[PDB]
Amino acid sequence: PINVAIFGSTGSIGTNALNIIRECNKIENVFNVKALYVNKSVNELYEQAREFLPEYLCIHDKSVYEELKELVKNIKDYKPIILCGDEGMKEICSSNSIDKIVIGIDSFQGLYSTMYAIMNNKIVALANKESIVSAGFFLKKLLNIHKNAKIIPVDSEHSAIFQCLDNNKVLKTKCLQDNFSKINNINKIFLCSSGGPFQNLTMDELKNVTSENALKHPKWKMGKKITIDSATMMNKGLEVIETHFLFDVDYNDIEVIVHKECIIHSCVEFIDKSVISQMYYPDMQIPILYSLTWPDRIKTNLKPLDLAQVSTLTFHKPSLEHFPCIKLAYQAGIKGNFYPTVLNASNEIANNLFLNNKIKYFDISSIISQVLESFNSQKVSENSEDLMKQILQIHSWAKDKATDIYNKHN
């Protein structure tokens, strides 16, 4: 019986996790949902608690804490431990009844909860790519100290890569470890991209695209920030750095490939040049499920892939002139140090400015480039606590520098 906590259970990752858990549990009792954690969605959490009956409930916002206590009195034969804030989150991570934690929260609370899950030697199913890009050095150090802790990737391309690896090799190492690629015989990665809504657009058309164009009739309905990142291909840029950190693959050995059908989710070339790929319909339930079942798989009732119906799969190179965010991501990754932290923070601001019609498409990459050029490399702190503060200071600095650049030109 797999004992799982869901952090951010009313978000997209959290609700997809509970859906696949429900469906798999109908086939065979595999999962025990031990904890649910949300920001402020009391009614939604109450409804989840009535179905899954977790041992723990937690809610960040303290003004709806007593409302939650009163709601759960309506549930028959059920006496949960009801907690609140960061202290509740810490108590959940330290519980001996929890084996695996799905991190479905963004920004700092994602990183903070990941930190606590690692400190308690848990399996961490991590969907927040920005935390790996920004704080990769810190997570790597924490994983070296807490030897039984593991990060298992949920980001679909990185789940795909992970699924292409031989678990007889994977089990000798773990993600975010030096020498991961060597142990797994990895030569090179094909990192698949949908390409977003702008692949056929000219440079002159790209000059005038708006956030409405990027968000209009999405093929897959996902959040605004990632949709804008998909449009600029900064999503893939961030994912290149994520690949480097998770799998210890050199930047020269990561190739972005535009695959508009989104059936092949990524591919791994091994040292003999054989290539393995993972395929399914574009659906987050498979990557989430594998993060919770690894190193095994369990039965689902998901729709089987019909390759004859799919019929055609296509691949092409992305144009770096048209999608300069990709180039900037590689440059930041290759330069190393805290340049990925700066890239991520400056993109957070630029993405949001574009979303709100404050800047143009190529201003996104212009601002990111300028902030990157404004940063000086820093000696990397050997001390774990100093290193986290260093990352947070640089993050804050880069957001401010991006905002100042905007303000001056405006």
Task: Please enumerate, by residue number, every residue annotated as part of a binding site for NADP(+).
Answer: 10-13, 39-41, 130, 223
Task: Give the annotated binding-site residues.
Answer: 10-13, 39-41, 129-130, 155-157, 194, 217, 223, 230, 235-236, 239
**14 in contact with ligand 6JB (CB under 6 A):** no
Q: 33 pairs with which residues across the strands?
A: 4
Alpha-carbon distance of 84 to 90, in angstroms, equals 10
Alpha-carbon distance of 224 to 169, in angstroms, equals 38
Shortest separation between residue 178's beta carbon and a copy of itself, angstroms? 20
Single-letter amino acid code for the residue at 219: K
Alpha-carbon distance of 147 to 377, in angstroms, equals 30
259 φψ region: left (φ > 0), alpha (ψ -120 to 50), beta (else): beta
**30 in contact with a copy of itself (CB under 8 A):** no
Q: Angle, nearest 10°, between helix axes 224-232 and 339-355?
A: 110
In the chain, residues preceding a discontinuity (C to N beyond 2.5 A) are none
Residues 52-81 that bind ligand 6JB (CB under 6 A): none
Shortest separation between residue 268's beta carbon and ligand 6JB, angstroms? 17
Residues 172-191 that bind a copy of itself (CB under 8 A): 185, 187-188, 190
What token pair was written down for 18? 């509970």
Residue least distant from Mn ion (Cβ): 155
Determine which residue in the list 53, 279, 380, 392 makes contact with a copy of itself, applying CB under 8 A: 279
Shortest separation between residue 17's beta carbon and a copy of itself, angstroms? 14
Cβ distance 333 to 341 under 8 Å?
A: no
**289 in contact with a copy of itself (CB under 8 A):** yes
Question: 167 contacts which partner out of Mn ion, ligand 6JB, a copy of itself, none, CB within 5 to 8 A by kind?
Answer: a copy of itself
Determine which residue in the list 113, 114, 235, 347 makes contact with ligand 6JB, applying CB under 6 A: 235
Q: Angle, nearest 10°, between helix axes 339-355 and 324-335?
A: 160
**194 in contact with ligand 6JB (CB under 6 A):** yes
**284 in contact with ligand 6JB (CB under 6 A):** yes
Cβ distance 254 to 189 under 8 Å?
A: yes
Cβ distance 348 to 400 under 8 Å?
A: no
Overall size of the chain counted in residues: 410
Rg (CA), the chain: 21
**130 in contact with ligand 6JB (CB under 6 A):** no
Task: Give the annotated binding-site residues for 1-deoxy-D-xylulose 5-phosphate.
Answer: 129, 156-157, 194, 217, 230, 235-236, 239
Cβ distance 13 to 102 under 8 Å?
A: yes
Cis status of the peptide bond prior to 295, with omega within 30 of 0: yes
**252 in contact with a copy of itself (CB under 8 A):** no
Measured from the CB atom, the residue of 106 and 155 that comes closer to Mn ion is 155
Alpha-carbon distance of 342 to 98, in angstroms, equals 35
Residues 147-166 that bind ligand 6JB (CB under 6 A): 155-157
Shortest separation between residue 188's beta carbon and a copy of itself, angstroms? 7
Alpha-carbon distance of 355 to 357, in angstroms, equals 6
Task: Give the annotated binding-site residues for Mn(2+).
Answer: 155, 157, 239
* 3-state DSSP assignment of residue 318: coil
Shortest separation between residue 12's beta carbon and ligand 6JB, angstroms? 8
Residues 148-167 that bind Mn ion (CB under 5 A): 155-157
Shortest separation between residue 18's beta carbon and ligand 6JB, angstroms? 16
Question: 262 contacts which partner out of Mn ion, a copy of itself, ligand 6JB, none, CB within 5 to 8 A by kind?
Answer: ligand 6JB
Measured from the CB atom, the residue of 101 and 191 that comes closer to Mn ion is 191
Alpha-carbon distance of 284 to 159, in angstroms, equals 10
Question: What is the biggest distance separating any 2 CA atoms in the chain, rounded to whole angstroms?
Answer: 64
- Contacts with Mn ion by CB under 5 A lie at 155-157
Binding site for a copy of itself (CB under 8 A): 163-164, 166-169, 171, 185, 187-188, 190, 257, 267, 269-280, 286, 289-290, 293, 295-300, 302-305, 307-308, 310-317
Give the residues lining the site for ligand 6JB (CB under 6 A): 155-157, 193-196, 220, 222, 226, 230, 235-236, 262, 265, 282-284
